[PDB]
C-alpha cells in the first residue's frame, strides 16, 4: 500500500510477473533511473455498454510523457521493462468482465488485403485506439482491421490467455498488475521503429447496470518503466 | 583397400532420415546465444493454459464476442437446462478451435484428463444455485433435473463461490457436461437480473499424444506471394 | 508417450517448399528461390506458434530431366550436370544464365551429375541478431524485419547442348535442425492471404450449431 517512485505516489492493496522473470539490467551504455522510474498515469477511458476494447502500443504511449520522451529522441538505442497497473472503479451494483493481456510483437493487419496500415492508425500518442464490433471494408485503403473477435491479428480472441494476462471481474476483483521484462531478439533496439509490447483491454461480458446507476465505469492505466538503459556517450 | 559391400537401400533419399551433412558455410563463427524469456521445451505447455470455450455458437454469435457468454436469467420454470455440450472429439463441437483443441488436431492418438472452470460474471448481489451434471461414456443425457442429480454432480452456490472447477477425463457417445437451474436468481432492487457465465478448459494431468499428422484447418491453393 | 510433443519432434521434419522448371537453350532458363518459410501454409502455421526461433538448416534437391521434342537425326546425349549456387545475404546475383556472378568464390556451389544420390547441403544459423523473428511490430514499409535474411538459391545446367532441348525440374526439401523456440503464440484462425504481412479477412470463431443445449 502507498508505493512511491520518484515524485509520484499511487495506492494499491496479486501480481502476475512476465514469463517468470524480473526486469533486470544487462560500446558502453548508461543507466538513468531518477529520470524514468516514476508512475506515468495515462488518461481514463470510459467503459460504456456498447464498448468493444482498447489497445496501447507501449513504447509509443510514453513518447511525449515528459523526460522518458526526451531520452527517446536523444539516445539512439535502449531497452526497458514495464510495470502496468490497471484498475477500474465501479460499485457493487455494476457487472462486467475484462481481460488485460500484454502481447509481445503484436503485428496487426490492414483492412485492404494488399496494403499495410499507416502510422497514425496503429498508435495514437498517449491516447487509446479502440476496437470495433463490425468489419472495416476493403474500400478503405490504409486502416487497421478492428474486428474484436479476431483481435486485429487474425487469431482467435479466446486464445489470448496464453500471454501474461489477468482477469478483472467486477463481482470479485477490481485491479490488475503486470510486470513485463524485455523480450526481443537483439539486446538493444531503436525505440521509434519498433513497438515490442501491446496492452489490450477487451470486455468479454459487457457492462450492465440498472436505471439510476452511473452509465460509465472509468478505467485508469498507470505505467512505470523499470530498469531502463540507453546506448550513448 | 578395404573391401566393402553396399546393401540395398543405399543411394536413396528417405525424407525422414537423420544423417550427417556437409556444411555449405564453414568457418563462419555464428552468433552466440542470448537469454530470451519464455522458452518452450514441449508443446504440452501450450495446452495446459486456460482458454475460453464458445458454448453459445447459435449460428449468428460466432462472429461476435457473444459466443463465449452463456446467458442466465430469472425465469418462471422449476428446473431448466442452462447449456449442454458433448465431449465427442473433433465432430464440430465447442472444444475444437480452443487453445487445447488446436494441438490435439496435430496428433492422432491422445488420452488424458480435462479441467473445466466456470465463472459467474454477474453482480455481487445476485444469488442462486446450479447443478453441474456429468454423464459417463455410455450413459444417456439426463432429460430432467432429478435424474441429473442421481448421477455424478456438483452443486454450485453462486453466493458463496464465484468459480467451480470440474475435472474430467477425455479420450480420443463420449460424455456430457450439462448444467441445470436448481433455484432462480434472487436479486435486490435496482440490480439487473440477466447475468452471464464464462467457461474455461485446460489439461489437468499430462496427456499422451502420439502419431503426429497435419491439421485439417489450414490449406492453400497456390503459393502465397 | 510424452516425447513426440517436444520441439525437436514437432518441427524437425521434411517438407517440399519449392518446385520450378528450367531448360538449357531458352537463354532465359534458370531457377531462383529466396529462402523463406512463408510460402506453404502447413509449415508457416507450425513455425508461427512461436515468436523467436533459432535453427540450423538442411536442404535436399531432387532433380529430374525430360527430353523436349527436337527436330530429327538420332539425339544421343551424355549425362547431365547441374550447378546449385547459394548466395549469402549481401552477395552478387545473376541476371542471365551466362554471368560473372556464377563464377564468384564466396558463393558456395555444388556440382551434381545425374544418376547418383541427391545433393544435400547444410546452412548454419546466419543472422546478426540472436534469433529469427516470425513477427515484427515495426517498420524497416511495415513489418519486414531485414535482419532474418537467409539468402537465395540458383540452379542451371552446365552442359551446352545443341542436338536436343532438355528441360529439368527441381524440388527443394526443407528441414530445420537444433530448433529452439521462445514466447508461444496462439494458432492462426483465418486463412493466409499474402506472404509478407499478416493481412486477413475476418472469419467466425468456430463452427456453429442450432442450439446451446
Amino acid at each position, epitope marked *: 500500500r502507498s508505493i512511491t517512485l520518484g515524485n509520484s505516489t499511487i495506492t494499491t492493496q496479486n501480481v502476475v510477473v512476465g514469463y517468470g522473470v524480473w526486469p533486470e539490467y544487462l560500446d558502453q551504455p548508461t543507466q538513468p533511473d531518477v529520470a524514468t522510474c516514476r508512475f506515468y498515469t495515462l488518461e481514463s477511458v470510459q467503459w460504456m455498454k456498447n464498448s468493444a476494447g482498447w489497445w496501447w502500443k507501449l513504447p509509443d504511449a510514453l513518447s511525449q510523457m515528459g523526460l522518458f520522451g526526451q531520452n527517446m529522441q536523444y539516445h539512439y538505442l535502449g531497452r526497458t521493462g514495464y510495470t502496468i497497473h490497471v484498475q477500474c472503479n465501479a460499485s457493487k451494483f455494476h457487472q462486467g468482465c475484462l481481460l488485460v493481456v500484454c502481447v509481445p510483437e503484436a503485428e496487426m493487419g490492414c483492412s*485492404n*488485403l*494488399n496494403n499495410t496500415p499507416e502510422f497514425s492508425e496503429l498508435s495514437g500518442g498517449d491516447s487509446a485506439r479502440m476496437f470495433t464490433d*463490425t*468489419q472495416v*471494408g*476493403e*474500400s478503405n*485503403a490504409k486502416k487497421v482491421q478492428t474486428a474484436v473477435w479476431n483481435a486485429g491479428m487474425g487469431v482467435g480472441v479466446g486464445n489470448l490467455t496464453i500471454f501474461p494476462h489477468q482477469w478483472i471481474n467486477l463481482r470479485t476483483n477490481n485491479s490488475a498488475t503486470l510486470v513485463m521484462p524485455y523480450i526481443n531478439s537483439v539486446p538493444m533496439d531503436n525505440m521509434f521503429r519498433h513497438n515490442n509490447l501491446t496492452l489490450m483491454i477487451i470486455p468479454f461480458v459487457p457492462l450492465n447496470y440498472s436505471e439510476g446507476s452511473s452509465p460509465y465505469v472509468p478505467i485508469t492505466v498507470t505505467i512505470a518503466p523499470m530498469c531502463a538503459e540507453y546506448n550513448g556517450l | 583397400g578395404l573391401p566393402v559391400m553396399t546393401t540395398p537401400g543405399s543411394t536413396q533419399f528417405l525424407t525422414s532420415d537423420d544423417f550427417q551433412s556437409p556444411s555449405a558455410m564453414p568457418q563462419f563463427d555464428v552468433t552466440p546465444e542470448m537469454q530470451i524469456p519464455g522458452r518452450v521445451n514441449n508443446l504440452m505447455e501450450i495446452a495446459e493454459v486456460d482458454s475460453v470455450v464458445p458454448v453459445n455458437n447459435t*449460428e449468428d454469435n*460466432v*462472429s461476435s464476442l457473444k459466443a463465449y457468454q452463456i446467458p442466465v436469467q430469472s425465469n418462471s420454470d422449476n428446473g431448466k437446462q442452462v447449456f449442454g455440450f458433448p465431449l465427442q472429439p473433433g465432430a464440430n463441437n465447442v472444444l475444437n478451435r480452443t487453445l487445447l483443441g488446436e494441438i490435439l488436431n496435430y496428433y492422432t492418438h491422445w488420452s488424458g484428463s480435462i479441467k473445466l472452470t466456470f465463472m459467474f460474471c454477474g453482480s455481487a448481489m445476485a444469488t442462486g444455485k446450479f447443478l453441474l451434471a456429468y454423464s459417463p461414456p455410455g450413459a444417456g443425457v439426463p432429460k430432467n433435473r432429478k435424474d441429473a442429480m442421481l448421477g455424478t454432480h456438483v452443486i454450485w452456490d453462486v453466493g458463496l463461490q464465484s468459480s467451480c472447477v470440474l475435472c474430467v477425463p477425455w479420450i480420443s457417445a463420449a460424455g456430457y457436461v450439462t448444467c441445470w437451474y436448481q433455484t432462480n436468481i434472487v436479486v435486490p432492487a435496482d440490480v439487473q437480473s440477466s447475468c452471464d457465465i464464462l467457461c474455461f478448459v485446460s489439461a489437468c494431468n499430462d496427456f499422451s499424444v502420439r502419431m503426429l499428422k497435419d491439421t485439417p484447418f489450414i490449406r*492453400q*491453393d*497456390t*503459393f*502465397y*506471394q | 508417450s510424452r516425447s513426440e510433443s517436444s520441439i525437436e519432434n514437432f518441427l524437425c521434419r521434411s517438407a517440399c517448399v519449392y518446385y520450378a*522448371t528450367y531448360t538449357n537453350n531458352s537463354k532465359k532458363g534458370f531457377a531462383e528461390w529466396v529462402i523463406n518459410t512463408r510460402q506453404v501454409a502447413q509449415l508457416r502455421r507450425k513455425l508461427e506458434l512461436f515468436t523467436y526461433l533459432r535453427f540450423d538448416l538442411e536442404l535436399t534437391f531432387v532433380i529430374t530431366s525430360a527430353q523436349q521434342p527436337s527436330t530429327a537425326s538420332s539425339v544421343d546425349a551424355p549425362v547431365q550436370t547441374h550447378q546449385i549456387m547459394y548466395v549469402p545475404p549481401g552477395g552478387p546475383v545473376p541476371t542471365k544464365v551466362k554471368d560473372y556472378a556464377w563464377q564468384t568464390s564466396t558463393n558456395p556451389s555444388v556440382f551434381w551429375t545425374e544418376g547418383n544420390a541427391p545433393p544435400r547441403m547444410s546452412i548454419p544459423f546466419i543472422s546478426i541478431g540472436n534469433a529469427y523473428s516470425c513477427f515484427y511490430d515495426g517498420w524497416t514499409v511495415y513489418g519486414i524485419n531485414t535482419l532474418n535474411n537467409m539468402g537465395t538459391l540458383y540452379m542451371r545446367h552446365v552442359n551446352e547442348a545443341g542436338q536436343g532441348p532438355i528441360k529439368s525440374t527441381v524440388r527443394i526439401y526443407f528441414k530445420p535442425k537444433h530448433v529452439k523456440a521462445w514466447v508461444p503464440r496462439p494458432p492462426r484462425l483465418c*486463412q*493466409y*492471404e*499474402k506472404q509478407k504481412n499478416v*493481412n486477413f*479477412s*475476418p*472469419i*467466425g470463431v468456430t*463452427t*456453429s450449431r442450432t442450439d446451446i443445449i
Partner: antibody
Amino acid sequence: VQLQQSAAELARPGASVKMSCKASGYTFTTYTMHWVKQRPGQGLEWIGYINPSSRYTEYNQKFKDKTTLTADKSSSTAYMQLSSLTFEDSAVYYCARRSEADRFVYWGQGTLVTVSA
Amino acid sequence: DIQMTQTKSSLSASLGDRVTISCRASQDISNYLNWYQQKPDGSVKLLIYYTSTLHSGVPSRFSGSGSGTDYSLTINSLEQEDIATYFCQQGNTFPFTFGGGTKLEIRR
C-alpha cells in the same frame, strides 16, 4: 469441389430476379463468394462479394443501388437479387470463389438473364 | 480504378506457332496480374496466377512475363484446344478490374 448455378431466367423491365450458386466439396463458411457480370459486347465486370460467416457484403460503386447478396449456411448457396431491371442488365452472371486475395480459382457456368416484353 | 487495356481484341494464328497477347494497365500494379481463359461454351479457368507462375493442371505451353505497366502471355505451341478468349485481371487496388477479351482463330 465445384460450383453450380441455377438455370436461365427471363423478366420484364421493372421486375426482379434472384439467382443462386450452390457450393459443394469444401467448407462453405471459409471463403468469400464473388459475382462477375459479363455483357456480350464487353469484358468481365466485378459486382461484389459476401462473407458467408458474418453475412457482410461489399458492393461495387456502380452496382450498389440494384444488387443484393444474401447467403445461407444450411443449403450452402449464395443468392443475388437484381432490382429495378433495365435493358442494359442483360448479361451473363458468374459466381467465383476468391483465395489468396486476388485469385479466382473456381468459377460457375453462369446464368443468362434476358429482359424483353 | 485501373483500366486494363488489351488493344488487340482479336488474334489470328495457325497451328504450332508462337502467339503473344499483351495487356497494358493505367499505372504500376507491381506484378499483380492474373490470366484467365474462357472456353467458347462458357467455362472459365485460371492459367497464370502471377506474372509468370503457372497454375497446377495447366500445360507448359503457356508462359507470361512483364514488369511495371506492360505484361504479356505467350503460347509457343498453339493446339486446337487453345482457341478461346483470354483476359487480364489486376489484383492491386480496389475494385478488381478485368481486361477486354482477346479471341483467337486460325489464319486461313
